[PDB]
Paper text:
Here, we demonstrate that the centriolar protein SAS-6 forms rod-shaped homodimers that interact through their N-terminal domains to form oligomers.
Next, we determined the structure of the N-terminal globular domain of C. elegans SAS-6 (ceN) by X-ray crystallography. We obtained crystals of a ceN variant and solved its structure to 2.1 Å resolution. The fold of ceN is reminiscent of that of the XRCC4 family of DNA repair proteins (Junop et al., 2000). Both I154 and the residues shaping the hydrophobic cavity are well conserved among SAS-6 orthologs, suggesting functional relevance. Although the conformation of the domain was not altered by this mutation, AUC experiments revealed that this change abrogated dimer formation. Interestingly, inspection of the ceN-dimer structure suggested that the β6-β7 loop encompassing I154 might promote an interaction between SAS-6 homodimers, as this residue is located diametrically across the ceN domain's C terminus, which proceeds into the coiled coil.
Residue numbers in the entry:
A (entry chain A): 2 to 104, 130 to 168
B (entry chain B): 3 to 105, 128 to 167
Amino acid sequence: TSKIALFDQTLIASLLQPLSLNQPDFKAYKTKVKLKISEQRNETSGEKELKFEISRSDDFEFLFSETLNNEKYQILARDHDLTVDFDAFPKVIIQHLLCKNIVPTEINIILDAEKNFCSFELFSKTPISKGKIFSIKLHAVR
Amino acid sequence: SKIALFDQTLIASLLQPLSLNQPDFKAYKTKVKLKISEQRNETSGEKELKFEISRSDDFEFLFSETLNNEKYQILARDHDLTVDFDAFPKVIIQHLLCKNIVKGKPTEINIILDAEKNFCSFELFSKTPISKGKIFSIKLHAV
């Protein structure tokens, strides 16, 4: 209804997940993931929300999302030294960061062992470091 | 055994508490001399990387730290560094502190002082479109 699609593309990501519940060492594969970013109105509050959703054909159980409002975003900005405001955030990553990964920015997705959660991480490599920009914890939709 | 790898005056942002009683910070752009060298530890014979900063504004502004391979491993771990101890200084010097040719954004240096000026954090940044892009920080101690 109020939902507005800002971004809907297939990107190459590295997918990591522990070998098992007891073995936290990751196995890692390059994989294609569909990322959708939209804005919507919270039904109870009327406030603006940013929704992130990932899926991939490889695994029907692979359905994750998170919704950020202004306050959730402030926490994110604080934790990652983000320099843009809530309203600018999606526009800048879409226009300056994500377009590069569509089927140098890198995307990592890290799964829970039980696949209840995944961390959606964006990177911009430096000559001496990984250059992690932020990570958002997404939860299983299913 | 000391070998100079880098000896240059750079523009930094200097942050420090208002006073010993006022923890809130004030910020100024300032010129700082940064020296990076390699040397042999006298007792162990191992290679050491020495960072030294100074500035003419304040004679008591004299800070250094020496990193050996082990100290570096801790740094690389804390900051997701992707190069080894031997490459570290060469890459920073050649790719982060270097002057680009006039024909991911420019590097920025932050120096954060202790209120008592016993320690300062030497921080290197490479700005992104949405974030500060802190690369690493090294705690230097008063000389």
